[PDB]
Structures are given as C-alpha cells and as structure tokens.
Symmetry: D2
Subunit: 401 residues, 4 copies
C-alpha cells in the first residue's frame, strides 16, 4: 500500500500540472532500450569474477538482468557472438550461425540488433580494417560487413521488428599522421560497397558510428564525427551518436535535433565517459536526462533507437546491465512527465524566467512514485531489493564459474 | 491529513527504513546557511532584464522578496561598492560606519553578513592590475582598501555574532601571451601579506582568497591562480575560496574539498554554473551542485565551510535568480543529509563496489521531494512553483515602475 | 637584397634540396595561396551605418594599405555588409552593389580579390538573439532578404574582379540558458537558408558558405547553427562549409576536419583565429594548430577548393599590427608546410615506419625555413623581420595618433 | 662548412637583438635533462615495437646509443624495479647495493642519477591503493618501500656528487563514483610524513611529490591530486613534481611554475605529450614544450628546477623516442636562451603589448636552428636528421637480434 499510496498522491500532483501519469507509463512502454551483449563476457565472444563463458551462460545472465528491468528491451549482438560447432571466418557468417539467438529472442519477446565485429582479429592488427590500404584485408572486412547485413535482415524477418546494424571500426593512428585523407577515401568507398545490397527496410537498418579517439589511436580516427555526419546525410543511413565518443564537454543531446533534420534515423549509444571514452555504467545524471528529454520532446519514438554502450568489468556484470538500463528508463520517464507544451510556450514568449523556474521545479515533483509503480506493473522490484537477486545469483551460479 | 503530511509520512517511513531520520535531516539543514550575493540585485552597480534595483533601499526590498521565498537560514554577501555614504568615500578610506544601515537591517532580518573588497570597475584598476600593480602608489591604494575592508568585516562579526568571511578576489591578469608571470605574483604575495597583517578577532572575521582561471580580457594569464592561492592559504593559514565556475573545462571543486581541507583551516565554496566558459549562470540542482553538497555533509564540514552563491544573470528576473539558486543549493544539501553515508562508506571500505554504485543510484529515486516540501512549508515558504507568482506580483507592482 | 639574406638563402636552398625540397617551387606555390584579411579588425566591427581605430571607409582603406605593404604575397579583403558606403542610411534588406562600388574600385587598383558576408548582428532586429531562425515571420523575412541581397553584392564582386567572392553566412542565433525546444529554430533555419540560396548565381562569381559556432557570450547553452547542423547543410545542399578555428569544443581542431569534410562538400572556407579559454578571437600565432591547418591544406593539394581567411579581433593592440602579425603567421605556416617532404613522409607512413615519420616531422622544425620566408618577403618588397613594426609605429605617430 | 657559415650569420642576427650566441651555448650546458629509464623496456623492470631491452646490460647499451645522439648534459632517472639482484628482493627491503652497477656506470658516463619508489605492478598494489591503503599492513609495506628508496636515492647523491631527486608517484584512486575521498587522503598525508621522516642530506637527496588527474581504471578519483600535493609540498617543504600529461584538458604546467615557486623549494618538471589522455607520447618541439622551457629560463631557474622526461611510447624505436624527446626539450631550452627577455619584459612593463606580441612572434623566424646545430657540433653529436641512420644501424645490428 505504501507504493500505492505514494502513487496516488503523485497522480494528483502531476494532474495539477497537466500531466497524466498513467499515460506516461504507457508511453514508457513504447521505448525499448537495446542491451549490449558484450558486457556479460567482457567482449570475448564465442570464436570481477563470474563472466559468462559461452552462449548458454550469457543468455542465463541476460535473463537474470531482464527480470530486474521493467519494460521493453532488445538485445544488441556483435558478430563474434555467433554459435557454430565449427569455426567460421568473419567474412562468411550466415544467418544459421545466429539461429539460437533468434529462437531465444522469440521466446523472450525481444527484438535483436546487430553489429559487424571489426576488431580483435589478425586482420585488424595494424589498426585498419575497412580503411586498410591492403586490398585483400580491406575486402575481407567489406565482406564481413556485407554478410553481417544479411544476418541483420534475417533477424528482422524472424522477429517482427527491424534490426539496426551499427558499423563501428577502430581505424586510426596513435601518433602524428601525415595522410588523414587516403584512409577516409578508402573508408567512404568501402562503406558504399558495404551497403550496396538493398535490403528490406522493414527488417534492416544500417547505422554508422564515429569516435573521437581510442587508446593506441588517439591522434587520428578515420571515421570521425564529420566523416560520418557527411556519410549518413549523403547516403541516407542512420547515424549513431555515442554519448562517450566526443570531445570533453561535447554533448550528443544537442546533436539530436540537428542531425534529425538530415538523417532518417538515429541510434543513440548511452554510456558514461570519465576522463576519457571510459565506458562507465550509465547513471541518472544530467546528460542521460538531457538525451531522454530530447528524445521525448521531439516525439522521436519511431526514428530513434536507444542502446547501452558501456563496458565495466570491475563490478558484477548483471548489476551493470540493471543499473544502466533502469537509469535510462528512469530518465525517459522523467522526460515523459515534463509539461512540455507549457514550457515551450513560455519559452516562445520570451518568459525565460518562468522557463528556468519551472524546469527546476520539475526536479522536486514526485516522479519517483511513478517509476516505482512502473516497476510494480512489470513485476520488477521498485527499489534496492533487486540487488538481493543479483547477490543470490552470484552465490548459486556465478561463484562456480 | 493534508497531502503534504501524507507524502511526508510516507517518506519518513521510507527513509527510516535506510536508517535516516527525516526530522533530524531538517534540523541539520538549518545548520547550513547560504550567503546570497548582493550584486545580482543591481548588476554589480553598487552605490558609489528590466527592474534592477537602483539604490540600497530598492536592493533591500528586492532581497526581502527573495528571502521570503527561500526557506531557512541565509546570509548576505556584500561588496565594498555597496557602502551607503551621503558623500563620496575613496575606497581606501571606507569605515564601518559606511555599512551601518546594512548591519541594522541584517540584525532585523536574522542574517549574518559576509564581505569583499571591490578591486575592479575603478580608475585605479584600469590597467588590469590592482594588488599586483607595478606602480607603488596604485598597489598601495588597493592594499589600503583591502586593509580597511577587513575592519568593516570585523565590525559585522562584532555586531551580528557570527564571523564575517571576507573574500579577496582580484581581476589581475593579461589578455595575451605574457612575458613575466612571476613579478606580478611576487608583488601579489607581498601585498596580501600586508593586507592580512592586522590581526583581527577570528570570532568576528575570517580572511579568504579566491582564484580564477581566466576572465574576459585577461584570458592568457591570471595572477591569482589556483596554485598561487592554494600555496597562499596553506602557508598563511587563511581560508581558501573554491569557485565552481572558475576552473578548467571538466574541472570540479567537489573533488578539491577533501584535499584542501587537510591543509587550510576553512573553505569558502562559491556555487555558480559555468556554461561553456566562466559564464556565471544560476545554480541548478545538477550533478556538480549535488557533488558539492555531498562532500560538505559527508565530511561533516559544518563548522569550517561557508557556502555562497557567486553567479550573475541579468537576462531573467533578479529576484527569481536568487530564489532558484538558493533553493537549489538547499535542495542539494538536503539530499546529502538524507544519504545513508555510513552504510555506503562501509560497502566501499569492503570493496563492494557493485552495491556502492547500485545504492548510490537507488538513492536518486528515494522520496527526498516530500522532505524538501515539508522543509519549505515549515519555513513558511512555497513548496513548489507557486513562488513564481509572488515574484510576478512584485514585478507588476514594484519592478515595473523602475 | 643584402648579401646576408642571399647567403642565408643559398644555404637553405641546398639544405632543402637535400631532402628533395625545391625552395623556389615552395615560394611559387606560396604565391597561389591568398589570405583573406577581415575588414572588421580595423574599426572594432563598427561598420559604417587601444586608440587609433578607423572611423570610415577612407580611414579603413588607408589602414589596410599600411598593413598590405608589410605582408608579402597575395591577399584578399573580406567585407561585411555593414561596411557599405552610401550618403544616407540603407535598410539591410535593401542593400545593393552600388553601395560597395568604392570597395570594388579600390580592390581593382590594389590587385585584391574581395569576399563578403551578410551582417546578422548588432541590429534592432537581431536584438532577441534570433535572425534567420526567428519565430516571427517578419523578422525572419528581413534577414532572409538581407541574405539574398548580400548574395547579389557578392556576385557583383566576382563579376568585377574576376575571382569568385566567397560569401559566408554566420548568425548569432541561440539561447543563453537551458532550452526547451532546440528543434523548431533549426527547422526554421533550414528553411530560411534554402530560401536564401534559391536564386542561382554564377559560380564563377559567387560561392555560398555556412559557418557554425559552438557558443556565444549571452548564447552559451544552445546555438541554432551548430557544427552538425551545417555539416548536414553543406553536404545536402552542396554549399561551401566554413570551419572556424576558435568556434569549437575544448581541444577540438579544425585541422582534422578538413580531410573529412572535403569528401562531402565542394569547398571549404577556413577561418583562422586563436581561441584563448574561449572564442576570444585573439591574433593568429605561428603555433601548433595554425601549422596543422596549413599542413592539411598543402598536403591535400587543396589550392582550388579552400579559401583561407583570418577571423579574429583584438582591440587591445595596434590594429594594423594585428593584421600584419596574423597574416604573416598564416603565410609562414603555409610556407613550412610547402617545405615539407610530404611524398617521402607519406611513403614512410604507408610502410608503417612510424619511427622515421615522427623523427623526420620533428627534424623539419630545425631546417632553415626562416631563410626561405625572408627571401619571399624581400622579393615582395616587404620587411623580412621585426623592422615592419617601425613602419607601424611611424604610421601610428603620424596618423593613428591624431585619431 | 655550411654549418659554420650558417652559424656566423646567426651570430650576427642574434647579436643585433642583444643576444650572444656563445653565452647561449654555455648556459644550455647548465641544463641537464633527466632521461627516464623505463622507455627502454616498456616499464617492465628486472624483478607494438620489437627490440625492447630485457636486462640491465641491454638497457645500458641502449641508453648509450641514445646518449651519443643527444648533445649536452643528461641524467638517468631510475625506477626501483630496475634493481640488479641475482635473487628476488622484496620491495620493502631494497638496498644501495642493489643499484651499484647503475652507480658505477653512471660515474663512468658523467651522469647524475635520479630515482623513484615503484608503487605499481605489484600484488600489494592490486586493489588500486598503496600508501593510502586502509589495510595497515599493505600501507606499511609501501611506506617501507618508499623509506628504503630514499636511502637508495641518498646513496646515488653521495656517490655521484649531485643530489638524486626522488619522485613519489602513486596510482591510488577509484575507477567509479566514490563515497569517501577524505579517508584515503588522510592516510596518504600521514603515510608521506612517515616516509620522509628520516633526515637525509639535502645535497645528496631531494624528496618530490607528483600529482595525477586520472588513471585508466582509476578515472573518478585520484587520492594524490594537484591540490593535495600543492598543500603537501608547501607545508612540508618538499619539491613538487609538475607533469605536462597529468592535468585537465587545456590545463598547462608552464603557467604553474611561477606560482608554485613562490611556495615550494624546488620543482621537478616532467615533460610529456598527453593525447586525449596521459598517453605519454614523445615530447615534441611544440607550444607547451616551448612555454615550459621559457618559464624555466626567464626566471633563471637553473638551480631550483629539475627537468625530466616522462612519456612512454612502445609503438616506435625506443632509442629514437628518447632521442627525439631529449633533443626537443634541449632545442626549446635553447630557444628560450636566445630570447631577448629583458627587452620583452621592458616592453610589457610599459604596456607596449603590440611590440611584445610582435617581437615574440618574430623570434620564431630568427635563425635559432644554426645555433642548435652548432651546439650539436660542439658536443660531437649529429646536427640534423642523420642521427636516425645511427639508430637504424643499431637496430639492424642490435635491436634485430632481440
Ligand atoms: Zn557506441
Ligand atoms: Zn567566487
Ligand atoms: Zn569565422
Ligand atoms: Zn610525471
């Protein structure tokens, strides 16, 4: 009844500022968050203690996390997560190698997203993949990405929802670079080849993702913010914006509204960068809230794909997924509880005083009560009690790995 | 019960469940005053968006309007240019008597007062140097102004029963590539020693020094830098002023608090929101404001910290700016007072970083709002946005005629 | 020509020849890279609607000629619409080529190309901090009109001078504080620019460019015309893209963006300036990023698709000096890039010989380029060194002083 | 040769600005650069790029090839893990004997040695805390290791007749949101006081403390912050280590030199090039390297500054890395020595900011290169890029057999 009592007070409070809490919960059910598989086994693939060591364990881990996160979710898979009794050369992956993932997804009412894996491989050892000067190596990655599109399309055909396939490459140089041009020219041509095969948009979407820098490649990144904004606008692919991939102080929240005027869809990777593209777990913080607000304010339900893109191996992995996913949903909920029309109007009239005042007052409205009921409705713990389940799971299962 | 009472009860139970006493949190919140900056009221004009105050009366009226909408203890932070004299007073000769009206009004309004010498917007500050000026007479004038200022400050402490913290900030610096960064710093070091040489009663006055990374037109070099003043406060044992808008991009004063406190006796924390630069925007209930509050409370700094606003936004209603900033700082302090610190510290000490991260994040969805609203109600101030209405009324009635 | 200069020059010639660099070719290539000097630095951006600033067209031209005789090689003048000359006030939206005739004439007599810019600031109708993106249709149309009119002046310049005029579009639009709707103003801006560029003009006479800004004082939380907004704009509409060196995030550098943008937009306008803690608009120095920008232009053989312009404003020192220092530094950075054995460095890089690449790049810094710069100055009847400052001081004494 | 012709021309150009090229060379010889031993073996110690050194002989051999290609005075900065023992030695039990071969070689090569306790890559540093570890036993182990290291350092000074600057750097910090930043800082401060409690001869040994903003896997909080160590160095009077790669984006140590020097007795400058992080890339002849050099020379810091390299690049030839970095620091120093500082200073003092800027910029095209090349010739070292050929040949002959 505590939870129910708080919910009822909240419902009246929000009603007073024109916000319907029941409607906000329904809208929250329209915003899946795509969970990254790679957090479960430290990006190992199948080619703090307790990491998953195979597909079965990764799925068991995912299910434990899923039970503690309310509402819709998707699973974002990397190519290295294929399941084949025999080894498969990247450039020859096929839908059958992801059949188990597909059946599981169906059983769990999940959509699946995908990504070619252009890293941790003999052919990525020089720090170039798709922009590699060597024609054969370059062809090898082009072929891997072409094959991955087909896997992506298969996901969409089987599951009823298009699979967003994100393209990210580590390509770049550690130190002062003489020719930033040639590798970009090669990248441009290669991607063109990559997306040449027309696939059903109902099942598949191509996205491109930039990075400012990587360890061991901090002086130059072939696929920069500008290179990709140019690519996405000119070839009409989705553009992926990564909250941890930009300059210090640089925010993707601002970029949403500018990019949407030129690209058909956006993929938002949320993560927390700390002193660098550190990939820390998403918190309910200023920038995560700004991203959620931009999504909801512009009614981006059908053109935005929300995903987690962090990696922390210093804490329980299941907890990392839980904490991050719940935070992203809490930020979306708060955005949905905003009296946007009222604020836009005040802003349109130059009432900047009221605008700031009311934005700040929203922070002390009882949104927590609404979140707790959302959890209850999805039979998920409303508060810290979820950690107990993770603890129990660690004791029974993970401790034995 | 009223709805406020019902929500409060709920919250009370919810927090008692994590070992937090909501009534006590409210009591502790009263030990943390926030010093309002007088200069936001008249665009730093002094008395030497429409509606700015034009004289002391107006400024005091405006302050009263903001204070009745801000719950709990407050202080007023005054600048030397806010003296009230019938005749002009050279800066180097101000006296306590030039701040009598301020003192009488602070007494009547249950406010402590803080002070600052005004080392800018003056013929003698035109070269961009004051206390570090190469010219002896110019340098002496600022030294003298600062010394006189300390006596005004001690006077406030003597009269109001709480020490006045007198912050020293100068604009000194160079816009472009500088050849000699040393000599201005040597002169600065010597000047301040001179400035703080008259020993005053610590029960009435405290000296503080404040760095700044850069300022428009003094962008390549600042005489009084962070290192300069951390060395100064540590070696001279003055208070150190940390300003949330005065550092490098990504740089945070919350981290600095526990480090500096091991070397300096007291800390003056200036909150403001830097936006793309040392812009001085109104303080929001955001990550860093919360971080600041959390360090204060976590390290039990009640008796060694002095909290004040330091921003200036003349694009919105001035009274609203003070109300928003002050209430935001109090909200952050209250959330820190509601943290189950002991438990978190224990998990952290055990290396349970999973539970520490989880529990920090779960604290964000605990019902601190009901506690805040009760705090406002008990202090006879609006719990929500209704305060805006008071401001608007005041604007129609009084501000619109300025 | 003194014997010392000639001697230093011949030693440098050999030295460079030894790394496969022809110094004479470098100077010829330097003559193909004009630098567009910004007119606004001469009068503090006052327009015609530290002491000694110019107060009108005549004074501005005289000040520019003093700067010009101290800067070697090709130059252009970048004019703002507020620099128009007419006996009586002209509404911004009604400006005409005739209002710029004396500029055109002066440019012909001085062998200068001319560049242009609509002026969307310092005006009653920009007071709200919105111009091309203003929600008010009338205000919006005023600025669109001002922009379409400006294109005509630009085209005229190009028709008259025989070199296309690059016309850069920059607006201050944004919000100081937390913003609710960043989309609407961007939608309006997109539409407004489409209207602005609707009239087709002769590309041999005119080029359109768009310039982003990260943040303006008073407009710090949101900038309508952001980097992404214009990158999408220029790619999609095929206008030139303007990259401003003071305009971005901390540690963010236009040198890296050059090669990315050029794959998508037809031309690039590079505005060089030095940000100091902010878009402070300080004078260009021969420093790491000015050199990085020069190297990118030269390495990629961008002679014909790049337009190099200064864009800073420093009112604390002598103005003529500011233009001289800035322009001379841009040219020196260009010359150093031209003296680089790029093909050899490129080949080492291609081989993964990063050791040799770093080493040689660093050794170039201690090669005698100074002698090459001094010869370029001498051939162009400009001071080789510090002596130009005397010229400046003399002019101050004689002219600026009396202002 | 052309070298000398070029030199003569330069001698004249610089004599015209009041600068004596011969005096510049003599002064350069008064500025040693402390090369970091760890660049040669990837910080492995003896407890992409091929050819790394694998033991003391190899590293010494490698250091020798580098030294022949770098003109002028140099020193070697050693880490405790570079001890030479036939058997394992617990870090807390190192002795002078364990570094005797280093001492002897140093004597022979006319080198001064600097030192550092190694509080990383060890089972007892695995939790990310060392001197600030809450476990008393772990903390003691590190305190003991640092105490023993001081004795090693004093030994070097005693043997070589030049003080060994022993730099204290710890990785201590937390990767994520931290609850208590105070407690580890209190432990660190006490720990350091113990560490430096044995008095040693200042002519043989100097203690230095080094801050860090963040470390990979310790990004949220660093126990030994800039303010922490500025307070420590000022209050305990140790040297302060300023690292060019350890601060916030856009933050520069060049500015800090003149501020810190008013409070601490000596400064250790660690030059390196951060790229997006403390990437420890090779020092370039660039803006900040030049700015640091300029501050040292401008303030005549010969005796109170210790210049060292602190970068680590494993992607290119290691010898080349040392050569480029050391030559680069030296070139920056030379340029600073060729600056007409007095004139500049006098312009600035007069407010002639036009001439100051103008002249600062014209120095960049003055023929300093001919002066650098002659410095190289005078020290029997390659003046230009030929040195690479020497490294190439050593790689061929030597670094290939590894
Ligand atoms: Zn991502
Ligand atoms: Zn302050
Ligand atoms: Zn520009
Ligand atoms: Zn260091």
């Amino acid at each position: 009844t505590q939870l129910e009592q708080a919910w009822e007070l909240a419902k009246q409070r929000f009603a007073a500022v024109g916000i319907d809490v029941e409607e906000a919960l329904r809208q929250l059910d329209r915003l899946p968050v795509s969970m990254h598989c790679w957090q479960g086994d430290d990006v190992s693939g199948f080619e703090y203690p307790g990491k998953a060591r195979n597909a079965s364990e990764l799925r068991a881990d995912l299910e434990q996390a899923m039970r503690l996160i309310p509402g819709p979710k998707r699973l974002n898979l990397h190519a290295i997560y294929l399941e084949s009794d025999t080894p498969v050369s990247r450039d020859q992956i096929k839908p059958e190698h992801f059949k188990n993932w597909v059946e599981w997804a169906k059983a769990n009412q999940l959509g699946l997203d995908f990504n070619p894996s252009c890293f941790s491989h003999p052919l990525s050892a020089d720090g170039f993949t798709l922009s590699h000067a060597d024609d054969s190596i370059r062809q090898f990655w082009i072929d891997h990405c072409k094959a991955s599109r087909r896997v992506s399309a298969y996901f969409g055909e089987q599951l009823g929802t298009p699979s967003v396939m994100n393209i990210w490459i580590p390509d770049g140089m550690k130190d002062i670079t003489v020719d930033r041009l040639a590798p970009r020219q090669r990248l441009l041509a290669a991607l063109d080849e990559v997306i040449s095969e027309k696939l059903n948009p109902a099942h598949h979407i191509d996205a491109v993702e930039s990075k400012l820098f990587g360890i061991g490649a901090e002086s130059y990144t072939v696929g920069s913010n500008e290179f990709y904004m140019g690519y996405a606008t000119s070839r009409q692919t989705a553009l992926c914006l990564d909250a941890g991939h930009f300059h210090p102080t640089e925010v993707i929240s601002d970029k949403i509204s500018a990019a949407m005027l030129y690209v058909p869809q956006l993929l938002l990777h949320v993560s927390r960068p700390v002193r660098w593209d550190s990939d820390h777990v998403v918190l309910l913080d200023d920038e995560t809230q700004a991203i959620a607000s931009e999504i909801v304010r512009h009614d981006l339900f059908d053109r935005v794909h929300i995903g987690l893109d962090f990696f922390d191996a210093s804490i329980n992995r299941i907890a990392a997924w839980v904490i991050g996913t719940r935070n992203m949903k809490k930020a979306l909920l708060r955005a949905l509880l905003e009296p946007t029309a009222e604020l836009r109007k005040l802003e349109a009239p130059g009432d900047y005083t009221a605008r700031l005042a009311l934005l700040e007052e929203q922070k002390s409205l009882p949104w927590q009560a609404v979140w707790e009921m959302y959890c209850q409705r999805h039979d998920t713990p409303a508060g810290s009690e979820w950690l107990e389940s993770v603890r129990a799971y660690e004791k029974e299962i993970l401790s034995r790995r």
